[PDB]
């Protein structure tokens, strides 16, 4: 797929992703905080359409992600992220997608997710996260 | 004066300041690097005009500030930053302003200046710097 | 289990752990680097004995861990860490223990593991890692 790398910021205010209950995660976009101002990240889109969009609007500064989890599995011959769940100190968003495959999770005891990088073809191939205090 | 706080970025690409050889530092604007791309900061301006503009363009990524020094003193009854000097690993830019009063200096052995905050009225009242690895 | 928290250091020089091919990880002791000198951490021991000891000696400050992976699963009614594997920029150490249950992994693109915390009863219950630049 096509790789993207948003870089690092001050925090996260909103996450806009899309999924298909039959396949995997599709589109992925993030509105970060850049020193008090919303920073509209580029919309990393899937090569195909047919996805259900979801908007995760966090109550930035008080609300922040404490755990990211999901499932990775095989879809049409490709290993992709099929499901994603975001847990904050206030609510649990998701699971979005298909909860099938091998689960993974990144709990954070101290620190913040301040950016994302990864790749998207038909679906979200993989991703990484920038962490900071 | 009016307080300002740029916040933290990825690095510094250019610094635009103004001064008067008889008073102190006036305007201050920074062009930061934000994840490999230029980010034009707000131009923090003096309540008055008639200053001499100076542009400090760094050979970002290879050139970076290693020491910031200057002088603080009284101008018309106000304690302000009268002079500023930026020393990088390649050259010394400065002194701009009046080298009179009490000196201050911040040499850096490891780390980078990634942001500025302070206040400016008729002149630059005070300032602080964000430091990071 | 009994909780432990080594805190953060400058790096990792050696890891001493024990395991039983039929259960899980039992003991855990790290020799950290503390500003260029070795610092022998507490040996966090299991409530029981009968484990096989393993010593992982790294060529500290050229060799460092890039990924930690393993398996968590039930043993006698408890979820514990059954296996651990340490991948450095030079070699792969492991898997130590039983590769059964749910796999997990923490790959690091940038940064270093500089400390561990967790809990050990009959076996390693869980663990977390301190990360830094």
């Amino acid at each position: 797929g096509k790789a993207f790398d948003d870089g690092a910021f001050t925090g996260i205010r909103e996450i806009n992703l899309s999924y298909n209950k039959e396949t995997a995660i599709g589109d992925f976009q993030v509105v970060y905080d850049l020193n008090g101002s919303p920073y509209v990240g580029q919309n990393h889109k899937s090569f195909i359409t047919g996805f259900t969009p979801v908007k995760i609007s966090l109550d930035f500064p008080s609300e922040y992600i404490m755990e990211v989890s999901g499932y990775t599995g095989n879809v049409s011959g490709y290993v992709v992220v099929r499901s994603l769940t975001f847990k904050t100190n206030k609510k649990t968003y998701g699971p979005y997608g298909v909860t099938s495959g091998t689960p993974f999770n990144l709990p954070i005891e101290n620190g913040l997710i301040v950016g994302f990088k990864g790749s998207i073809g038909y679906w979200l191939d993989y991703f990484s996260m920038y962490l900071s205090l | 004066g009016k307080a300002f706080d740029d916040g933290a970025f990825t690095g510094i690409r250019e610094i635009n300041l103004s001064y008067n050889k008889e008073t102190a530092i006036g305007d201050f604007q920074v062009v930061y690097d934000l994840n490999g791309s230029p980010y034009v900061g707000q131009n923090h301006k003096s309540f008055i005009t008639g200053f001499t503009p100076v542009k400090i363009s760094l050979d970002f990524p290879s050139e970076y500030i290693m020491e910031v020094s200057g002088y603080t003193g009284n101008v018309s009854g106000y304690v302000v930053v009268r002079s500023l000097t930026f020393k990088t690993n390649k050259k010394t830019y400065g002194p701009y302003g009046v080298t009179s009063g009490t000196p201050f200096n911040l040499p850096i052995e490891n780390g980078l200046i990634v942001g500025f905050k302070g206040s400016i009225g008729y002149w630059l009242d005070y300032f602080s710097m964000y430091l990071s690895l | 289990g009994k909780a432990f928290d080594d805190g953060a250091f400058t790096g990792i020089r050696e890891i001493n752990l024990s395991y039983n091919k039929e259960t899980a990880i039992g003991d855990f002791q790290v020799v950290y680097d503390l500003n260029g000198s070795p610092y022998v951490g507490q040996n966090h021991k299991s409530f029981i004995t009968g484990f096989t000891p393993v010593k992982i000696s790294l060529d500290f400050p050229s060799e460092y861990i890039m990924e930690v992976s393993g398996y968590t699963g039930n043993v006698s009614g408890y979820v514990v860490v059954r296996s651990l594997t340490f991948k450095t920029n030079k070699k792969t150490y492991g898997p130590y223990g039983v590769t059964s249950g749910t796999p997990f992994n923490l790959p690091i693109e940038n940064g270093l593991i500089v400390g561990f915390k967790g809990s050990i009863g009959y076996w390693l219950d869980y663990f977390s890692m301190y990360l830094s630049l």
Binding site: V81, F127, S132 | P61 | E109
Partner: peptide, 15 residues
């Protein structure tokens, strides 16, 4: 050498 760094963990998904 002049660019600030940040801790980065991952990839999860396709190897």
């Amino acid at each position: 050498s002049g660019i600030s760094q940040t801790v980065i963990v991952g990839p999860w998904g396709a190897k």
